[PDB]
Design a protein around this ligand. Sequence first.
Ligand SMILES: [Fe+3]
Ligand SMILES: [Fe+3]
Ligand SMILES: [Fe+3]
Ligand SMILES: [Fe+3]
Ligand SMILES: [O]
Ligand SMILES: [O]
Lengths: 528, 530
Amino acid sequence: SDNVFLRSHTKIEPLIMRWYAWAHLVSPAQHALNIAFRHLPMLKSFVASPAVHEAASSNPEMLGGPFLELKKSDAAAVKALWQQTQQQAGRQIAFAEALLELDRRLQQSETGLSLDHIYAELPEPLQGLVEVSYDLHNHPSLRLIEELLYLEDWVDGAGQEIAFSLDKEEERAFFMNTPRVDAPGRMVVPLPFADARFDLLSASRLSSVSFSQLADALEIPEDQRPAFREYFTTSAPQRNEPEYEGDGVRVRYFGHACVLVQTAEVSVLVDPFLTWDHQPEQGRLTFYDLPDHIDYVFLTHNHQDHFSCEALLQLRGRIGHILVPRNNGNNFADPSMKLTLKRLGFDNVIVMDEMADITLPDGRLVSLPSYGEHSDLSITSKHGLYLSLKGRSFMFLADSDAKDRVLYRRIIKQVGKVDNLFIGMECDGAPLTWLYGPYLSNPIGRREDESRRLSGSDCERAWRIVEECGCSQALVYAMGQESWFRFVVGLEYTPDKKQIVESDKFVDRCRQAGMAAQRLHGCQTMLL
Amino acid sequence: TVSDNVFLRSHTKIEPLIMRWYAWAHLVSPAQHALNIAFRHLPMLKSFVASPAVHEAASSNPEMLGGPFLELKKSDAAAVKALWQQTQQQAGRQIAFAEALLELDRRLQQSETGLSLDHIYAELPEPLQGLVEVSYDLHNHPSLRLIEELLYLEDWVDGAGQEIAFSLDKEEERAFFMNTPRVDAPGRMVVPLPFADARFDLLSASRLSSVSFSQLADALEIPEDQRPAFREYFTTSAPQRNEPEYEGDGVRVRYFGHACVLVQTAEVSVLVDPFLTWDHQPEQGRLTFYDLPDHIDYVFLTHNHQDHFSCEALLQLRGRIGHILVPRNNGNNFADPSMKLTLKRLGFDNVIVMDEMADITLPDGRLVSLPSYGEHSDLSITSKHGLYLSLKGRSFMFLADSDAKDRVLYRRIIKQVGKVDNLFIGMECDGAPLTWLYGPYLSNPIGRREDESRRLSGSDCERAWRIVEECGCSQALVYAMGQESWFRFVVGLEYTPDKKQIVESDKFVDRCRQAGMAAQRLHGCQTMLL
Ligand SMILES: [Fe+3]
Ligand SMILES: [Fe+3]
Ligand SMILES: [Fe+3]
Ligand SMILES: [Fe+3]
Ligand SMILES: [O]
Ligand SMILES: [O]
């Protein structure tokens, strides 16, 4: 009689070689580029002077910078992981080094003549995996045949683990800064993400599971099992109205860019990033407050604050279809989100082109074109969402930057007028290299780096969408102001920050036009 | 009482025309169509109206076949000038889009070197607003991505200019497809009909099933003055068919010419690169359009070239194809329009866009979409893919004009799909230069050696032998050579035995037979059992 649930606040943190698993560590090409040109430099730089990294991590303004949030005591662990990563990922570092070295060579040497000679001189890690081509101006680009790369022998479950923890989410270290080294209260269990055993682990969130059977499946030493039992409880988790049986449309804003739309017949989840800590003063909606079945999960783009492998892995058997955008195969920074999801065990993945629609009970959903927020890189894995359910029209644009009002004019011509606009106002994002640094074979200038930021719409540009779509309500979302997103989004915005000032300008101009408008802060359940 | 239930005459050809130009894939896609109207079609017509004799001089030269010269001659000058003035009025929005697109692309290449591109959208000309996204590659080179899904809903993307040319002349008389516009001429009756129009499906039904002539002419809005002449393309007799269906327990393969190959079990049919003939000739032992089964489960399109993507063959097969399989396109390249979107404008929504190594299950087997390299002048065109086919134990690999530049690539494929029994390879290893096909899409002219260095070239003897060694086929068949007569107007001259393509193919078939394999260069139609 060992039927146990996961404790409601037990966090299942997925780790790839102790680094928090975000999308680019799951796709192999970007993972190799991140091991060799992000993780190894930060780990080696930490070993040389741990004091340097605490000093940068102490200054809260540069919270996301390339420095570990670890302390001098963890020096032994960092150096060990740095050496472990050298031997474990030897094929990865050879691929990343060979891939970038090829890319530098082509820029210098290929000027418009035939590229047939290149395939003869391809290094072994790239042989049969890369196609060399030109644009219409004799600039070479490297196109990875990702489907063949995913079947390479070094694309395995090695390094994939899970970190059980009971600490509050505000305690999480930054996802790209800090590896999850061994710590008290943190129990790391080796487990491939696509493994069936994970499905048994995800079942214990909402359904009772035998503890000994689960601990046996999870290869848990019996000496460590008393400590592993701490993450489990006999009581079932409390859930705040997961289902909805009204004839209307219920929208639940779960924080940042996570918003669930629900009729009594369909559920649509946009950019799932959830919390497992309940805290009533903030009136949180948690992972448990989601319905048992989510018909459609919509992934706007491939950023860590909209693509949470932690949330998706525990929601695997509960998701009818994941809706993703198409990727640009000719760009290293744009891996296919299907495949990345396939490696996480997801085959219910629909790649949607622009203006592609799916018919839903009492309505439809359309994948909309989106511009920007990717440092002006030819990344195409971005799309907005038009949602129609029982007469109510919704448009979620996430961090899309409305550079061209005529684009949304053309969009409204097909999908019609929208009732509720969800727009993100992160208009001062990180520079290019903060995210796409390890993928650059040749470094970029600081003026170029600071001009192309991960920035969305400001007040003026967001007003273009409102004018074109004629919404009665405009909701500013995807601001990252809730507490449990600090470890992914960064600092909470003080009222003087441009993102808060511009957002305040936008809500005011909307109300001046006679619409309902607000900046979402804290979780909210709305009926409409 | 005047009961005239009629079929289409077996040798009646229905030539789809977009402003009297033979409609191939790039004239159907609007952006490339606009670029071809302004930067290929309009120049050739103006060049014809000024000294048409120059065009007669090049059209006499059999070497300069397909060159930028009309195969019309001087009597058609009055007709050509009208079309040159007519298309100028009709395609005003098209030329304005093409001029703005190339001028924009020229501007960004000159000035945008790595700083933010946000200013570009404010200075976008009206033909491009809301339709193009400006972006960088990883080396600060700007690219233009047309939102093709939005462009296809633009106001000038309509059925205007789309017609069909009924003619009874042998395919042997056809003018080159992009050389020469189909001006009004005797024996050619041009009927206005949009390609995606439902009425087109009714006309295609008249190929194999009888329809009332008066009812058919009424739908196609044929004026009663023209109906006596329209009756010439129709016959009361039913068309003759050479064993179209297959109910045998084996696998029947039928070679229809060039790269068109039909594979058939008793339970599924797969058509590769449909390019058919409507002229019967038993002396050549032709397999014709009518010899295809009534229903084609799967039509597989290797890539987006005129000799493998025939709107003529596909339009009459509408409603007869379960699913058309196409490769994915790179939206950041002008020369790579989406083949799904091009087919949607032809009335096909049963279009499955297949990624690399994507497989679909078939009765008694499956097919896999294979990676393919080259034959696109080293341009970032991704709308190309090979086909692995397994049916009742028989394994096929159709590679069309694939250039095996990387032997390990096919090694990796064989690790997944297994050994192949029958390989279909093209040895067109001296194709046309880059500008012959993608000329109007260059914002800045390209140098002549670079143009001739990167040709529409496939596998030669060595590279095709790389595939054979990697896949271990018991049979190797050289196809997609353009050796059949009815492929003039698309492929060009027949290759004499001294031409590089024939010498390399003969060398390859020789090395195959020396190894104990079966090999031949497919010439003329063939029905094979396996
Ligand atoms: Fe983002
Ligand atoms: Fe974001
Ligand atoms: Fe071709
Ligand atoms: Fe060909
Ligand atoms: O950001
Ligand atoms: O070709």
